[PDB]
Point group: C3
């Protein structure tokens, strides 16, 4: 484990995702509202999945070597197995908050799968220049997601209860800022141009992951928007 | 790329799926009917997924070598990753058109997963004679799907609006004819008996894919069956 | 095939899953109740999936070698591909029986995916002591599932029709007893401590699989709880 300088950030990430999972699990014990139960189930699964994948990276299972640039490059593939399941769950939290229609939910989840799937292909591609073709396709899929979150959901939240509109607006802004950083870290990190070393890259993804999952969840599950209007 | 004679058909397929995706995306911009939005989302995702997998084959990522018959045989595995997601989406288009019940939808999607999954196992199997055992199981799963589309959905469409009944009947006939060709191309192509060479096999799958996805989508999204009855 | 002593139990399992699939398929022909159709579709898919994965193990495709303990250990990975899809389908049978809320269904299916996913990682892990870390995480996920089936569903079934309450109680008890045996067989078998040899381990999993899928299905599909109350 300790033979890799980035191990400290993988261990911290593992701990923070595990602690986040347990807090949400305990906090959700005393909840019977069927609407609130939906948000607790979605939001608790997110850091639980991330916990297992951070642990796999810490123990060395989620790491492979990819030859490109005449070098064997360490690629943590477990990140994409994490994101494949956690990013659509996070979008479902937002879509259920605004009572989005089914067709829009399917478009979001499908574009998200394309985003993560093409990012994985780009991470494992051995022809250096082709890695950035996949990065560009994946980034186009992300821009579609961000467009929908702004010019489809925002207008839908305003016609909703005030507390669900204000909570959505906050979580929307958090998501757009944090998610946009991921393609940048990829491009300048060891998967892309190799400007930033792997140990610093790992620290950046850990800060982003914890903020986008645990921080996101703390804002959502403390809001009254997750409960139905009741007397 | 150009070192493979089949590259021209992979490049054409990539272009036609990309163009198809963009047309459906633009055409769906001016749509607010929640029913129509469902069909546009399903139908636009189909060629978008196929685009990415054709590109992976063009660039050489979606290709592996499988030893059988005393030879290293080029097997494009990316086809099955495509079909795993696009064939159930196409069946969902048909099932939603006739307002099929949930139990029937699950049976269709499950049989479809078995069809594609066993076809993938057959494509990667190293014992030559066993490849055709998997082909037979996969073909049995397809025949179940075709039976349901005829002796379960057809009777359901007649009790529906006339425009949804006539549109379903057309898309049903297109699907049964085109899908039935796939097991035949597999059997006589490089995955099976090896009668037809890979470059011709690739041309045939490209014609079938574009027809079953883009051609299918053009018929559906030009129909009024996708809109609810409104004044 | 016959070069492996466990082949006899893989062949028996294949036959019993295939026969089970055909019986459920025939029995479900004469069913039009939309509620009953749901249970028949879920319950017939379970042994059909298991059939294909037992066949892959029989023919040698679903087997790999994992080095640990200074030895190349035969690991049947196809079991986890089976369980990944069949265990959530079995939980869906139970959840639909008691009309569970959506949030609870998602929590069950998500915990089940974590259970199977971490068990697969543990089966393929090359550092011997780490294999049991994954076993423990997977077992914690199972205990969560069992808790929900007892202290969330049981109370919900009592407020239901008497026949659905008594049928659920029976299937609940069958599930908790049979599922609990799996982590024990893993721990003492070739994936874990290696006390029980592989051929005996394979026999035990076959008895458990057939009972948990075909036996489970025979109890459910003979009950009147799967039909709506009708005159
Ligand atoms: C009902 O809706 C509320 C349940 O949602 C919340 C239910 C959760 C979604 C269930 C998923 C958690 C499982 C219990 C998994 C247990 C293993 C975890 C990875 C444990 C990690 C923390 C600890 C080991 C440090
Ligand atoms: C509606 C939305 C959900 C739609 C989703 C969008 C999606 C279509 C976007 C594209 C996804 C696609 C790129 C997934 C590729 C997975 C692949 C990286 C797995 C590893 O295989 C890659 C190479 C080794 O580098 O295999 C070496 C050769 C091996 C012999 C490969 C044989 C196994 C194949 C991988 C079998 C295909 C399985 C499916 C891809 C499983 C789904 C994986 C997940 C990442 C989507
Ligand atoms: C709301 O419902 C309508 C949206 O459906 C339609 C929405 C679509 C389903 C969203 C999926 C498309 C994404 C925007 C993916 C973008 C990358 C594409 C693969 C681009 C391919 C064409 C071009 C690069 C040649
Ligand atoms: C309700 C419906 C959706 C049900 C679906 C029906 C489905 C059950 C039908 C059978 C599907 C099954 C054959 C999928 C097999 C995937 C497999 C080809 C992936 C590549 O692995 C094959 C060998 C190399 O040749 O791995 C070499 C050895 C490696 C060490 C393998 C270890 C990884 C395992 C593959 C882990 C299992 C992952 C799941 C199979 C992922 C789903 C893939 C998709 C193709 C279903
Ligand atoms: C409508 O709801 C009822 C259909 O459910 C029941 C429908 C089933 C869920 C459909 C799935 C079965 C498919 C027909 C697959 C056929 C291949 C099987 C694996 C055959 C195995 C048995 C035989 C080959 C020994
Ligand atoms: C809501 C719920 C459904 C959530 C589900 C819970 C889930 C997150 C729990 C953890 C699942 C995770 C451990 C799955 C790992 C699959 C992995 C074993 C496949 C084989 O790859 C392992 C190594 C060889 O030993 O690959 C060698 C290196 C290769 C180069 C690997 C590159 C391919 C990657 C495997 C791509 C990721 C694909 C996804 C993991 C596909 C889903 C598989 C299924 C088992 C979940
Ligand atoms: C909890 C994890 C989250 C919210 C991860 C989000 C990840 C992304 C938005 C990743 C995007 C990428 C691109 C847009 C292209 C480059 C490759 C990716 C996958 C890093
Ligand atoms: C857009 C792609 C489509 C509609 C693909 C359809 C593919 C099939 C219907 C494939 C069927 C197969 C068999 C029936 C057995 C032989 C292997 C397959 C997977 C080619
Ligand atoms: C039809 C198959 C069924 C119902 C299989 C159930 C399997 C389990 C409940 C497996 C549980 C495991 C653990 C709890 C940890 C050890 C590894 C597993 C996956 C065997
Ligand atoms: C979206 C965030 C990207 C900003 C990356 C900042 C990295 C600064 C760290 C110093 C770079 C290390 C280079 C010298 C080793
Ligand atoms: C009462 C609110 C705080 C509860 C404690 C939460 C502990 C989980 C770890 C959170 C750290 C990361 C927060 C986002 C920066
Ligand atoms: C379902 C369509 C299958 C028909 C295949 C027709 C192939 C004819 C092309 C000529 C065969 C090439 C053999 C000589 C190289
Ligand atoms: C107005 C209808 C035609 C629009 C142009 C569609 C261009 C997408 C490519 C379609 C070619 C394949 C059609 C099926 C044979
Ligand atoms: C949950 C069931 C686990 C019980 C396992 C009993 C196995 C007894 C078979 C004899 C053990 C073989 C050891 C000598 C070869
Ligand atoms: C009339 C009920 C029996 C029908 C025959 C079922 C045959 C399928 C194989 C069942 C054997 C396994 C039963 C569970 C132990
Ligand atoms: C490729 C993996 C995608 C599945 C991720 C799991 C979450 C799915 C959310 C589905 C939302 C409901 C759509 C109607
Ligand atoms: C194995 C991958 C299957 C999933 C394909 C994605 C489409 C799923 C459609 C689900 C239809 C809704 C069923 C109720
Ligand atoms: C185009 C939709 C408007 C909202 C999206 C904001 C774009 C942020 C740019 C992200 C940069 C990634 C490289
Ligand atoms: C048996 C259901 C009737 C409709 C299915 C038509 C069968 C077409 C044969 C396809 C040939 C594939 C080898
Ligand atoms: C803790 C929830 C109560 C019901 C679960 C029964 C636990 C059975 C123990 C299984 C042993 C697996 C190692
Ligand atoms: C080795 C660098 C080659 C540059 C390729 C950049 C491709 C980016 C595509 C974005 C449209
Ligand atoms: C090398 C050819 C061996 C023939 C096997 C055919 C199997 C087909 C099974 C269809 C029932
Ligand atoms: C080689 C045996 C090492 C023992 C590790 C046991 C780990 C079990 C963790 C359960 C909390
Ligand atoms: C609940 C605390 C979980 C912390 C265990 C993971 C941290 C790795 C320490 C080496
Ligand atoms: C929108 C046009 C997309 C065409 C790019 C793919 C074709 C491959 C050319 C080499
Ligand atoms: C319907 C009977 C299915 C039996 C075939 C599988 C058994 C393997 C025999 C070698
Ligand atoms: C993106 C930063 C999240 C901050 C988490 C703190 C929330 C406390 C209510
Ligand atoms: C299967 C052939 C499809 C033909 C596509 C043309 C549709 C234009 C309306
Ligand atoms: C767990 C044992 C199941 C027994 C199956 C027999 C059911 C006949 C109704
Ligand atoms: C109005 C809410 C502002 C939230 C933005 C937070 C950016 C990290
Ligand atoms: C909408 C604000 C985008 C912020 C992008 C930050 C990328 C590091
Ligand atoms: C490929 C772009 C299509 C141009 C608009 C078609 C008419 C909606
Ligand atoms: C009555 C519609 C006929 C459609 C059949 C088309 C076959 C390619
Ligand atoms: C229902 C007509 C079937 C046509 C099969 C064509 C196979 C090449
Ligand atoms: C009251 C029903 C008892 C069922 C338990 C069966 C254990 C195999
Ligand atoms: C609730 C009874 C548990 C039985 C466990 C059996 C494990 C072999």
């Amino acid at each position: 484990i300790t033979g890799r300088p980035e191990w400290i950030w993988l261990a911290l990430g593992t701990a923070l995702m595990g602690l986040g999972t347990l807090y949400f699990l305990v906090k959700g014990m005393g909840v019977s509202d069927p609407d609130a139960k939906k948000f607790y189930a979605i939001t608790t699964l997110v850091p639980a999945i991330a916990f297992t994948m951070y642990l796999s990276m810490l123990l060395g299972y989620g790491l492979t070597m990819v030859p490109f640039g005449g070098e064997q490059n360490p690629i943590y593939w477990a990140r994409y197995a994490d994101w494949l399941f956690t990013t659509p769950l996070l979008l479902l939290d937002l879509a259920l908050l605004v009572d989005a229609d089914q067709g829009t939910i399917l478009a979001l989840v499908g574009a998200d799968g394309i985003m993560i799937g093409t990012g994985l292909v780009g991470a494992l591609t051995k022809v250096y220049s082709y890695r950035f073709v996949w990065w560009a396709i994946s980034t186009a899929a992300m821009l579609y997601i961000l467009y929908v979150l702004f010019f489809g959901f925002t207008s839908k939240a305003e016609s909703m209860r005030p507390e669900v509109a204000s909570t959505f607006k906050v979580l929307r802004n958090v998501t757009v800022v944090l998610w946009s950083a991921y393609p940048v870290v990829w491009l300048i990190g060891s998967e892309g141009a190799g400007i930033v070393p792997l140990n610093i890259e790992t620290l950046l993804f850990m800060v982003l992951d914890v903020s986008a999952k645990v921080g996101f969840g703390l804002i959502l599950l403390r809001s009254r928007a997750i409960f139905g209007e009741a007397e």
